[PDB]
Amino acid sequence: PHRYRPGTVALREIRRYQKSTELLIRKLPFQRLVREIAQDFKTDLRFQSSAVMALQEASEAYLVALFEDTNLCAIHAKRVTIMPKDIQLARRIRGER
Amino acid sequence: HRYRPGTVALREIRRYQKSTELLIRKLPFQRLVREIAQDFKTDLRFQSSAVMALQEASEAYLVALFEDTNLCAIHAKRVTIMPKDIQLARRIRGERA
Amino acid sequence: TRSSRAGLQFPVGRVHRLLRKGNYAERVGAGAPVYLAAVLEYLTAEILELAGNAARDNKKTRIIPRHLQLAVRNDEELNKLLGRVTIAQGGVLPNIQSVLLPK
Amino acid sequence: AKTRSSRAGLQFPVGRVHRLLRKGNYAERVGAGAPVYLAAVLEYLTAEILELAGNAARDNKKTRIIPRHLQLAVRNDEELNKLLGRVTIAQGGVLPNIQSVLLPK
Amino acid sequence: KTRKESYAIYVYKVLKQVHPDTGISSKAMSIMNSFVNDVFERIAGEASRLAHYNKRSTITSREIQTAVRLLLPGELAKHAVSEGTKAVTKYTSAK
Amino acid sequence: TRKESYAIYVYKVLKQVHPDTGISSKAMSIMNSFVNDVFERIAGEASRLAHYNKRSTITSREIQTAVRLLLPGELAKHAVSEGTKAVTKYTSA
Amino acid sequence: KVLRDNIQGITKPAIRRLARRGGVKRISGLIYEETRGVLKVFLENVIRDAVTYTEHAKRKTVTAMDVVYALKRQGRTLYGFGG
Amino acid sequence: NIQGITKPAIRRLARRGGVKRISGLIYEETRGVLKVFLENVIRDAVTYTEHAKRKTVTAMDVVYALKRQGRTLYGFGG
Amino acid sequence: IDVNIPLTLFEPDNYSGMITSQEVLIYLWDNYIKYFPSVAKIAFIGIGDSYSGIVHLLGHRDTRAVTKTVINFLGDKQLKPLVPLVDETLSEWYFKNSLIFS
DNA sequence: ATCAGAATCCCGGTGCCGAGGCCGCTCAATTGGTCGTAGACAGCTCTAGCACCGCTTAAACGCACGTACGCGCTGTCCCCCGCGTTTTAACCGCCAAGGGGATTACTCCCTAGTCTCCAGGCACGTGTCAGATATATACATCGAT
DNA sequence: ATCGATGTATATATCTGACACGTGCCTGGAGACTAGGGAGTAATCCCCTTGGCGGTTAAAACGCGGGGGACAGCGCGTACGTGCGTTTAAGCGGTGCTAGAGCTGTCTACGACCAATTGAGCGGCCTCGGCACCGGGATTCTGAT
């Protein structure tokens, strides 16, 4: 039973996901999701699929941006591991309310 | 009697955030601004409220940067600061890379 | 006029001339200076009301812009709203934490 | 040769640009050679972008350019990564920006 | 010699509305004149963009209604829909 | 119909750099959005300049200045140089 | 008629993969909900604007153009979609 | 001048800035970043004034330089 | 360097002499003098005719990266003004360091 | 708890300077009125959003094991706090000087306006090669003993 | 140190639709001419800016001492990577329908545009009181024990 030391083949896949460009949010969950959010303002509108793809690209872009900020917060936090306090610190630095 | 560290520190935080007042000797900073203002242009009369606006920009931006530096120290479980707090703080400003 | 007949404080002639001058589209439907004047008058009523409350907190009877920045940091729609804009003579407010206070 | 751009040796139509400047509510009247200068800056920056886009497709061995190459071409050049940091390219892709403290040891 | 216009007397009397007997400095009034010009520019710029988006040459109170419920968070924006449609019927009252 | 894009002039400057290179339609969308973006930033910036200067039309001095205000060093340098090259090349003859 | 549990479709491994593109070595267990909650606070700040476009446009269909115009005013401009 | 700004003024701004105990390379790093701040502002304000054909940089120019990156001071030359 | 110009016949302004002065001036600066690397302090001296070709070296080329001040003994000939083309700053530089005598 | 020792507050007199107010000027608003066209408004077609179904499978979930990363404790050494002593240059008031923009009156070239002419540029149609996908092969690194 | 599995890179052939081109038809682009207003320039004003002087005057500097804050060492504690088997639902695609987008066509309302008279809005004016100045006495901690 052979078993890797932790997080290193994870970093090999960090090299994999930073060798690429793609989306990762799958389409029917985000479709159902944005129909739930646009449901909450005025109901039952038809859309564009390109609208869904535009919101999905902006979603994953702002995600991986704040994931790299949270990684830099855990580095300055003298840690290998992250916390929600890294995220909360990032919101009060960026001024989010 | 000899006080511990923190006493006049907290008392001067309460004193300086009471007052509505400027804090910097003016003409050393005007010597700094004309020491910049020589560098690319000549025959330069100036107007005083532009120097007052640069004063407000510098004081407001740097009390803001002491606030970011303070909250990186709050994240850092410390009271005495480091320059690397300022480096992380202006990365997550996005002012600095 | 066009303004007292509309019942606002914010002059439709001024604003109409400046929208004419300001190059947005070609022609102007005249409710737009009136509706713009209404939103501008309501938001300056917001700012002056919270600024007068912040001047009531400190009792400088002429509003120093300390009170204006206090009126920013009170209203979280305004604090969330005007989050990139500086205020001269505005001051700050205390914030001292669990790592900062003496134990 | 109908075009005003061959009189200046450009490639971008100053009649079209002068039209959308006239029909755009930017200014009231629109001059002659200020659209020529604007089309010159436009033509220079599209040559300068597609320079490094051809470079980044070139080392990635591609002809029909995927915008990975475009994201490299903006984000590497810190005159233009400075100037165009606000906009993510769709299917941009991220750089290997891996800090040493989380690298193994 | 320039008889230069600002937003002095209007913001003055709006302060006389909301706080009936008080005072202000000229510096804070310059902040307020700045603030009126800033919000004038942002609603006017969004009106410019939405007028170019809708392929048309004019801008009415309808366009200011949709501009402000794009601009403010929707409680303040919908209160401004109340003040604005108030002003719609109260300016289509007279000429 | 008509459809005023800039794809063939992008093809012109593309072939000026290389005959070896294929654009995508999405890369044309990136490039045209870049055109329309930089078009309207500079166009509103020249409009801002003419609002500050209180005139009616636009000289290429304003385009020169706004290129120096927006663009950094080599970018504003080479763009001012290419622009006054074009000012010479048209306005001269 | 409202929809429900769609943010449950955002599962913990998908956020974990996007943090692996975000360079992150070690992944805490305390994280995954607040991200999604911030994601809710993302889209609540989007479409509060956005339908106000197409309600003005008198359209019962919603474009990607309104999304693009919203991300101009949210300051999150992306290309690849035109206009 | 470049060292006309002293260490205790930086500590007074730290005490209005909520900072309670302070390190020392901080002061020189602060003077450098302040001078970078002022050089970019007066870079574009001088560029506005050379367009203006004037030999006096106005506060208008400084507010417009703040108005480049969304950092607008209210009250002094909008 | 000396260049003589053969005149134009029965003519009030020596016009094709000005034409070949633009051919000479544009050909010398756009064929060899940028490809002289070791060059500074050029002065142009025009006697009589054909000032408009050297005016055409100023207002149509950046020759002032190497040259400094132009000399003209105009005298009785017609005025050849520098047209403001790229700016009126190079014409202001013309207005500061040049000489024309009539 | 018990101490001084600082640091903080509140008061009556003086005194001063920026709001704020009114005076009056003027120029843009307003009004009165006409004109034309953008756009209101209705009709028509034709796009594309919605739905549904069934074959596949990628993703999500769960468990077992344990390892190595967070953190709590201790313990020290030097970097700040407090406080004592010595030097600068910030500020105020005084005059002196000149740069340049505002204001004023003047003219002219350029860009807009208009008209008429025609190929640049568009949609539409078409054929093809870079690129994706699928399968075989070697190369790097991490890790367990 | 030799060994393995996982990821990366590469080599192949193959097929497709997007690109890239070609085709043909027109409207917007080009040309030619005018008129008007934009813009550019010079002459006087006086206002605004620089500059410099000398006196106090607190702030900067410098130094001193030890505690508590930094940092390192150790040990503990635990959750997340890794591996495998199970399950859920997204993706795929294939068919059909109509709502609403989009295109069209006319009519008129709505806005532009012009002229003639008026007060909305500001500068200039002065005075006054909100607030800075302060000197004394009440309290409210910090640290030592």
φ, ψ dihedrals at D45, nearest 5°: -70, -25
Q: Is C87 on the interface with H (CB under 8 A)?
A: yes
* D68 in contact with chain A, both atoms CB, cutoff 8 A: yes
- Indicate the pairing of strand I70-73 with strand I98-101: parallel
CA–CA separation, A23 vs D90, rounded Å? 10
H or E, element range at D94:
none
Is chain F in touch with chain G: ≥3 Cβ pairs within 8 A?
Answer: yes
Q: Do chains I and E touch (3 or more CB pairs under 8 A)?
A: no
Q: How many residues does chain H have?
A: 78
Interchain CB distance below 8 Å, B63 and C102: no
Q: Match 């872009």 to its residue by tokens.
A: A61
Classify residue I60 by its DSSP letter.
Answer: T
- H36 in contact with chain B, both atoms CB, cutoff 8 A: no
Highest CATH level, class, for G8-81 = mainly alpha
The alpha carbons of chain A give a radius of gyration, in whole angstroms, of 18
Quote the tokens at residue E16: 């006389």
Which domains are seen in chain B, by residue range? 1-97 (1.10.20.10)
Q: Provide, in whole angstroms, the distance separating residue C25's CA from nucleotide J77's C1'.
A: 72
Chain E window 66-95: residues with CB closer than 7 Å to nucleic chain K are none
**Is residue G65 classed as helix, strand or coil in its secondary structure?**
helix
Method: cryo-EM
For residue A15, the chain D residues in CB contact (below 8 A) are: 96
**Residue E60 CB lies within 7 Å of the nucleic strand K:** yes
Instruction: Report which of residues 18-47 in chain E place their beta carbon less than 7 angstroms from any atom of strand K.
Output: 23
Distance CA A46, CA A35 (A): 9
- Break chain G into its structural domains and give their ranges: 8-81
Q: Which tokens sit at I102?
A: 């009539």
Question: Which is nearest to F38 in space by CA: D48, A50, D9, H39?
Answer: D48
Is the C-beta atom of F59 closer than 7 angstroms to strand K? yes
Q: What CATH code would you report for D1-105?
A: 1.10.20.10
Resolution (A): 4.4
User: Which nucleotides in chain K lie less than 7 Å from some protein C-beta?
Assistant: 4-9, 18-20, 27-31, 37-41, 48-50, 59-61, 65, 67-70, 79-83, 89-91, 99-101, 110-112, 120-124, 130-132, 142-144
In sequence order, what are the beta bridge partners of F22? D64
Go through the domains of chain E in sequence order and give each one's CATH number.
7-93 (1.10.20.10)
Contacts for D94 with CB less than 8 Å, ≥ 6 apart: A18, A64, A68, G21
Q: Which neighbouring-strand residues pair with I73?
A: I47, I101
**Do B69 and B81 form a contact (C-beta atoms < 8 A)?**
yes
Chains interfacing with A (3 or more CB pairs < 8 Å): B, C, D, G
Q: Do A18 and D99 touch (CB under 8 A)?
A: no
Residue the block writes with tokens 């607040």 = G34
The SS3 of residue I67 is strand
Question: What are the tokens at A45?
Answer: 């509108």
Strands C62-63 and E23-24: parallel
**Could you give the dihedral angle defined by the CA atoms of residues C25, C31, C35 and C36, in that order, rounded to the nearest 10 degrees?**
30
- What is the SS3 string spanning chain A? CCCCCCCHHHHHHHHHHCCCCCCCCCHHHHHHHHHHHHHCCCCCCECCHHHHHHHHHHHHHHHHHHHHHHHHHHHHCCCCECCHHHHHHHHHHHCCC
Length of chain G: 83
User: How far is residue G13's CA from residue A25's CA, in Å, rounded to a whole number?
Assistant: 11
Nearest to D93 by CA among A12, A7, A57, G76: A57
DSSP letters of chain F? ------HHHHHHHHHHH-SS-B--HHHHHHHHHHHHHHHHHHHHHHHHHHHHHT-SS--HHHHHHHHHHHS-HHHHHHHHHHHHHHHHHHH--
Which chain F positions have a beta carbon within 8 Å of D53's beta carbon?
A: 27
- Which residues from chain G sit within 8 angstroms of residue A7, using beta carbons? 25-26
- Assign E37 to helix, strand or coil: helix
Put simply, whether A73 touches B (Cβ < 8 Å) is: yes
Whether residue G81 and residue F29 make contact (CB cut-off 8 A), yes or no, is: yes
Tokens 């034409």 found at? I19
